[PDB]
Design a protein around this nucleic acid. Structure first.
Ligand SMILES: [Mg+2]
Ligand SMILES: [Mg+2]
Ligand SMILES: [Mg+2]
Ligand SMILES: [Mg+2]
Ligand SMILES: [Mg+2]
Ligand SMILES: [Mg+2]
Ligand SMILES: [Mg+2]
Ligand SMILES: [Mg+2]
Ligand SMILES: [Mg+2]
Ligand SMILES: [Mg+2]
Ligand SMILES: [Mg+2]
Ligand SMILES: [Mg+2]
Ligand SMILES: [Mg+2]
Ligand SMILES: [Mg+2]
Ligand SMILES: [Mg+2]
Ligand SMILES: [Mg+2]
Ligand SMILES: [Mg+2]
Ligand SMILES: [Mg+2]
Ligand SMILES: [Mg+2]
Ligand SMILES: [Mg+2]
Ligand SMILES: [Mg+2]
Ligand SMILES: [Mg+2]
Ligand SMILES: [Mg+2]
Ligand SMILES: [Mg+2]
Ligand SMILES: [Mg+2]
Ligand SMILES: [Mg+2]
Ligand SMILES: [Mg+2]
Ligand SMILES: [Mg+2]
Ligand SMILES: [Mg+2]
Ligand SMILES: [Mg+2]
Ligand SMILES: [Mg+2]
Ligand SMILES: [Mg+2]
Ligand SMILES: [Mg+2]
Ligand SMILES: [Mg+2]
Ligand SMILES: [Mg+2]
Ligand SMILES: [Mg+2]
Ligand SMILES: [Mg+2]
Ligand SMILES: [Mg+2]
Ligand SMILES: [Mg+2]
Ligand SMILES: [Mg+2]
Ligand SMILES: [Mg+2]
Ligand SMILES: [Mg+2]
Ligand SMILES: [Mg+2]
Ligand SMILES: [Mg+2]
Ligand SMILES: [Mg+2]
Ligand SMILES: [Mg+2]
Ligand SMILES: [Mg+2]
Ligand SMILES: [Mg+2]
Ligand SMILES: [Mg+2]
Ligand SMILES: [Mg+2]
Ligand SMILES: [Mg+2]
Ligand SMILES: [Mg+2]
Ligand SMILES: [Mg+2]
Ligand SMILES: [Mg+2]
Ligand SMILES: [Mg+2]
Ligand SMILES: [Mg+2]
Ligand SMILES: [Mg+2]
Ligand SMILES: [Mg+2]
Ligand SMILES: [Mg+2]
Ligand SMILES: [Mg+2]
Ligand SMILES: [Mg+2]
Ligand SMILES: [Mg+2]
Ligand SMILES: [Mg+2]
Ligand SMILES: [Mg+2]
Ligand SMILES: [Mg+2]
Ligand SMILES: [Mg+2]
Ligand SMILES: [Mg+2]
Ligand SMILES: [Mg+2]
Ligand SMILES: [Mg+2]
Ligand SMILES: [Mg+2]
Ligand SMILES: [Mg+2]
Ligand SMILES: [Mg+2]
Ligand SMILES: [Mg+2]
Ligand SMILES: [Mg+2]
Ligand SMILES: [Mg+2]
Ligand SMILES: [Mg+2]
Ligand SMILES: [Mg+2]
Ligand SMILES: [Mg+2]
Ligand SMILES: [Mg+2]
Ligand SMILES: [Mg+2]
Ligand SMILES: [Mg+2]
Ligand SMILES: [Mg+2]
Ligand SMILES: [Mg+2]
Ligand SMILES: [Mg+2]
Ligand SMILES: [Mg+2]
Ligand SMILES: [Mg+2]
Ligand SMILES: [Mg+2]
Ligand SMILES: [Mg+2]
Ligand SMILES: [Mg+2]
Ligand SMILES: [Mg+2]
Ligand SMILES: [Mg+2]
Ligand SMILES: [Mg+2]
Ligand SMILES: [Mg+2]
Ligand SMILES: [Mg+2]
Ligand SMILES: [Mg+2]
Ligand SMILES: [Mg+2]
Ligand SMILES: [Mg+2]
Ligand SMILES: [Mg+2]
Ligand SMILES: [Mg+2]
Ligand SMILES: [Mg+2]
Ligand SMILES: [Mg+2]
Ligand SMILES: [Mg+2]
Ligand SMILES: [Mg+2]
Ligand SMILES: [Mg+2]
Lengths: 56, 119, 123
RNA sequence: GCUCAACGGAUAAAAGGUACUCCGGGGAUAACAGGCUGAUACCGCCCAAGAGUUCAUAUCGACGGCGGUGUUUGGCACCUCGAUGUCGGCUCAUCACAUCCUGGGGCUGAAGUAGGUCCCAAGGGUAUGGCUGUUCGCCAUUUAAAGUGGUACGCGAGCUGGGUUUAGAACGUCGUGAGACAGUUCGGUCCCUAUCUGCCGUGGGCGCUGGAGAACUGAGGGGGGCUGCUCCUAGUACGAGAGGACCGGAGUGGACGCAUCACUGGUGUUCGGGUUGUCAUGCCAAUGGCACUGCCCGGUAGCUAAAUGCGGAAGAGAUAAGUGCUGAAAGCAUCUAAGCACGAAACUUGCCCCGAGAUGAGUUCUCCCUGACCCUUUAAGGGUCCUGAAGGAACGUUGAAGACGACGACGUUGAUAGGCCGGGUGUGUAAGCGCAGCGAUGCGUUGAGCUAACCGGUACUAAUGAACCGUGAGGCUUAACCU
RNA sequence: AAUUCCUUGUCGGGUAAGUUCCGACCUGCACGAAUGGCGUAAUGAUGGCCAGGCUGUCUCCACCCGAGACUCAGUGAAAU
RNA sequence: ACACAGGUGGUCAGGUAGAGAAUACCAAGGCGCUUGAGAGAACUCGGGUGAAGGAACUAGGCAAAAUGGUGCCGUAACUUCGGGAGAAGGCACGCUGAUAUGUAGGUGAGGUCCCUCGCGGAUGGAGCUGAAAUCAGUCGAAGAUACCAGCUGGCUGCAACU
RNA sequence: GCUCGCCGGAAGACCAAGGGUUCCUGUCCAACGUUAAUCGGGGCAGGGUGAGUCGACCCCUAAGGCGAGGCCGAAAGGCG
RNA sequence: AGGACCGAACCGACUAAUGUUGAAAAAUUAGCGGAUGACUUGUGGCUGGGGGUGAAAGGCCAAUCAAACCGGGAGAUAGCU
């Protein structure tokens, strides 16, 4: 259940070949407040698709 | 396999889910907007919105049913005196999910679930 | 739906009250036996003065099952117990002379025309 | 002056036990398995004395001879003692053919039926129990048949731990004894999160020479291949009768496999009801919590088998053993040398599935892009500005798709999901009120009320205007056409 | 037979079928009288066997409820 | 060795049901166990239910399942006369009403009498408490309804037993 | 803060033994806490334990220890 | 009355499963035995290594027992690796 040879750092790099993170593609921009947010999420100030959906 | 089934297990047993949605449906009627996780917010629509539809017909029996679902007379009073006539013309869809990002403690995808006629 | 080690009640006046299926005949690895099926049995309980004796080994035809039998409309006819009629080993004709309780239309054939003749009710 | 005889004589002077054990070492040396060998074993063959009424060779085969296999019992001690876990069972198997069944034949001391024997054939199939730790074996009852072997006497980083083989105890037996016994008896810790190969699945990358969306061809690979019984032919052929067919046709099964949920059922802690104890909602009434879902009773969808559909083929090609036709060498004969025909579940096809990473990267159809310039080291070059297509991806709503990716549906021009409305189904006459009753309770309102995943609807809620990726006509060389 | 090698002795019972069990036989390989002999009610987390009830033990598994496994975020080993 | 499912002597002992310090639910009081969030594959873990069959499984009924309470009836071989024995087997069991607006029983006040006189002795029965049984009725599939809570019998080896 | 769940012959309360400031308050979050931490039994600073009757000490002895002299023993020492 | 019976505390450890780099250097879960006695438990004492102690398993004597632990002879010896 354990190895018999030390796997190389080359094999280590090939296993980590798929472990890269995917950056967010494009931030949607609100039409009223003009700030950037995740697509289909509310903004930090509380806007979503123009209207002020939550006070603060 | 999970063919054609419904209802989220939410890593809880059946009595905990029923008691959590009993607390959470009362908390949504009380404050008209709450912030919970996105799977719990989507599953809460199947609890609160049958209670509001129950509240459109103010009978003594329906007060007893809504009390049997919620077990809080303050919620049952708010359902039939306020949210009953507030949603009396809407054909369902009494609430709204607003995804609000990610919780800092555990990266849980959160969401605001609110009533429609709040603001 | 009779298999090995299944106890059965006895549906005729052959002298047995309780027999046990020891082999479902007619095919290798054959699991079950419905009605009309021949089973080799042994006798576990008999009347004191019968045609058969406790410990005899002989054949039997299943005539009633608790699982039941299906008809081509989709209907099914279930009984409350498992019942079989004893047969001879060689001539394979029934030993008793009077069949007790009902039987089914699946039983009737050129092979078991005698048993449905003697049955009080054929469903 | 020593049978110091273990005779180059360890001392004048010395026996045992250890399964309670321990250390140093050895594969220098045993037990397991491999290896080598093949006496033995098993399987063939040669000669033919005889048996077989006669008749060696239908079937047998004495005396003897020659081989094969690696398969038993062994031989050897080459690998391993700084560890290669062992009998049997279980669960997966896989190969051989010296074939148990089914298939094709030859001969028969083959009437038929049923056999004997040998040849071809490995496609598929190839019991359940009783006893015993058993393999084996005997026995019971099946079956078309219950094949023989290889696989570390296949398989313990898959399971078991009954046997063997630790420490306890006992019997018989042996010993003065400690103890010992392939003698028995009762009891007795089975570890490992998988790096690589392998395998089962499922993705990312890039390639296939402009890019993109599809539909394909099929190089190749895999799956599958079992069989009973009854009826007809026909009581015909055969036979003294008893009995009883080939060939051909039809039906119905067993086992196995694939699919499915319409039926019959199971489950159905998300639906309904009953009920016990207790606590709470001010109390009554009515509910809820907890007690394995408290304990039950039913049960929707889904998933399911025991449920019910379907499958194994037919056919074709080339054959094995075999059977021939014509026909010489060899005036005859002869299946073969030339030529031709037939011949099996094997072989290649036919059936099903995967499948162009088939780098030999294929084919078809459709869609998309028709800008300017700088550069020096001038070339399949580098850059700037303009441009951003077809499409994709991401995000969201999600799915009878799913570990995750993937795949499919949908995103307002919208039924994708939730809700809602209606229906269905399930449960079984809610609550409240009234009546009857001393009361428990009964009756009426009432097939009431509630009803999950189902069916048909419905934009009520959530599926955003965008942005992002992908570009800007696509090398060389000939050839054939086009002007 | 906790003792019996031959041995699965033979016979009987039980079972469709019983190397175990129970009852006999005696041919005690290799019982035997306080390293006690033979019985024995009661008792035993004791050994073997049989029957009834019971059942997923099994034919042959199906579904469901939860805890992991799987995905994300945080921390972060080990034998070799 | 750990903010470790372990170990650690004494004292306190509420309610309802119950024989009970069992057990279920609670009071006073104290906690939610120092990673979460999803998903709802195989497989493993701990459970639930199961058609038909019912030990065919297996070394072996291992494990599961089943039995389970109280009262009454009834109970074998054998025996050291104690046992065996809860042998086995069976019946009853809820609620309401009546007997009895709460009985039998328990408790025991005023009142009266007596007295060596007091924290006295009679008498007296108010009030409180309260089984158990019978009869009648009534509800459910099921009344020891949950938790809790013996599987039973036959033969035999060995050891008397705790 | 409001609900929900759990223990309740304990997972509540009081001690002995043992530990030794973990107590309370302010402040801090590097390390420690199997994650984050504003929180903590963590760091830092301050505060906190009041007895004629509780307990110990003390008076008394048990098992036992030590033991003037003594007896015994190469020495050490043993016993009393 | 009882080395009586059933059964919690308490004491024990028969069976199975889990666990086996564990929560745990022997435990958990569901069952199980004893449970007025040869019972169990607190505190304190005493017995010392060829010695103790042992309802006897070569058991136990500080996670160590066919002769404990620590220090010393001591760099024992090792024809062995
Ligand atoms: Mg190596
Ligand atoms: Mg990775
Ligand atoms: Mg759905
Ligand atoms: Mg989780
Ligand atoms: Mg519960
Ligand atoms: Mg010598
Ligand atoms: Mg010499
Ligand atoms: Mg050694
Ligand atoms: Mg060697
Ligand atoms: Mg060898
Ligand atoms: Mg030879
Ligand atoms: Mg001849
Ligand atoms: Mg010959
Ligand atoms: Mg010969
Ligand atoms: Mg070999
Ligand atoms: Mg050879
Ligand atoms: Mg050999
Ligand atoms: Mg040599
Ligand atoms: Mg080797
Ligand atoms: Mg070795
Ligand atoms: Mg090695
Ligand atoms: Mg051959
Ligand atoms: Mg032949
Ligand atoms: Mg093959
Ligand atoms: Mg084969
Ligand atoms: Mg082949
Ligand atoms: Mg073929
Ligand atoms: Mg057998
Ligand atoms: Mg071999
Ligand atoms: Mg092997
Ligand atoms: Mg084999
Ligand atoms: Mg093995
Ligand atoms: Mg063993
Ligand atoms: Mg011994
Ligand atoms: Mg030996
Ligand atoms: Mg790819
Ligand atoms: Mg093929
Ligand atoms: Mg065929
Ligand atoms: Mg169906
Ligand atoms: Mg359906
Ligand atoms: Mg059903
Ligand atoms: Mg159910
Ligand atoms: Mg169903
Ligand atoms: Mg209740
Ligand atoms: Mg009430
Ligand atoms: Mg509660
Ligand atoms: Mg509770
Ligand atoms: Mg063919
Ligand atoms: Mg010629
Ligand atoms: Mg010719
Ligand atoms: Mg041909
Ligand atoms: Mg429309
Ligand atoms: Mg919808
Ligand atoms: Mg409806
Ligand atoms: Mg209906
Ligand atoms: Mg009503
Ligand atoms: Mg109700
Ligand atoms: Mg209805
Ligand atoms: Mg619809
Ligand atoms: Mg003997
Ligand atoms: Mg013997
Ligand atoms: Mg048996
Ligand atoms: Mg016998
Ligand atoms: Mg047996
Ligand atoms: Mg005997
Ligand atoms: Mg003796
Ligand atoms: Mg003697
Ligand atoms: Mg004795
Ligand atoms: Mg992670
Ligand atoms: Mg902790
Ligand atoms: Mg109490
Ligand atoms: Mg308790
Ligand atoms: Mg924790
Ligand atoms: Mg699961
Ligand atoms: Mg169950
Ligand atoms: Mg069943
Ligand atoms: Mg049912
Ligand atoms: Mg049933
Ligand atoms: Mg068996
Ligand atoms: Mg078996
Ligand atoms: Mg058991
Ligand atoms: Mg049980
Ligand atoms: Mg015996
Ligand atoms: Mg004893
Ligand atoms: Mg400190
Ligand atoms: Mg503090
Ligand atoms: Mg502080
Ligand atoms: Mg920080
Ligand atoms: Mg930290
Ligand atoms: Mg501090
Ligand atoms: Mg004092
Ligand atoms: Mg003294
Ligand atoms: Mg002195
Ligand atoms: Mg002294
Ligand atoms: Mg006692
Ligand atoms: Mg002990
Ligand atoms: Mg326990
Ligand atoms: Mg007891
Ligand atoms: Mg010993
Ligand atoms: Mg020790
Ligand atoms: Mg010593
Ligand atoms: Mg020594
Ligand atoms: Mg020295
Ligand atoms: Mg040294």
């Amino acid at each position: 259940a354990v190895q018999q040879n030390k796997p190389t750092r080359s094999k280590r790099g090939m296993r980590r070949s798929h472990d890269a993170l995917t950056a967010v593609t494009s931030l949607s921009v609100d039409k009223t407040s003009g700030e950037k947010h995740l697509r289909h999420h509310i903004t930090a100030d509380g806007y979503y698709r123009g209207r002020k959906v939550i006070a603060k | 396999m999970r063919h054609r089934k419904s209802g989220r297990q939410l890593n809880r047993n059946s009595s905990h889910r029923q008691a959590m949605f009993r607390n959470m449906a009362g908390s949504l009627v009380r404050h008209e907007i709450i912030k919970t996780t996105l799977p719990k917010a989507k599953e809460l629509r199947r609890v609160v919105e049958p209670l509001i539809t129950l509240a459109k017909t103010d009978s003594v029996a329906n007060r007893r049913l809504a009390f049997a679902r919620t077990r809080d007379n303050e919620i049952v009073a708010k359902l039939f005196n306020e949210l009953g006539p507030r949603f009396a013309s809407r054909a369902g869809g009494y609430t709204r999910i607003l995804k609000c990002g990610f919780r800092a403690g555990d990266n849980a995808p959160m969401a605001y679930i609110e009533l429609v006629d709040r603001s | 739906m009779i298999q090995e080690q299944t106890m059965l009640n006895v549906a005729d006046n052959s002298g047995a009250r309780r027999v046990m299926c020891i082999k479902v005949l007619g095919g290798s690895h054959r699991r079950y036996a419905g009605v009309g099926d021949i089973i080799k049995i042994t006798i576990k309980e008999a009347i004191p003065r019968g045609k058969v004796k406790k410990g005899d080994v002989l054949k039997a035809v299943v005539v009633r099952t608790k699982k039941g039998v299906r008809r081509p409309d989709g209907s099914v006819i279930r009984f409350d117990g498992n019942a079989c009629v004893l047969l001879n080993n060689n001539s394979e004709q029934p030993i008793g002379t009077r069949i007790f309780g009902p039987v089914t239309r699946e039983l009737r054939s050129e092979k078991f025309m005698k048993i449905i003749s003697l049955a009080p009710e054929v469903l």
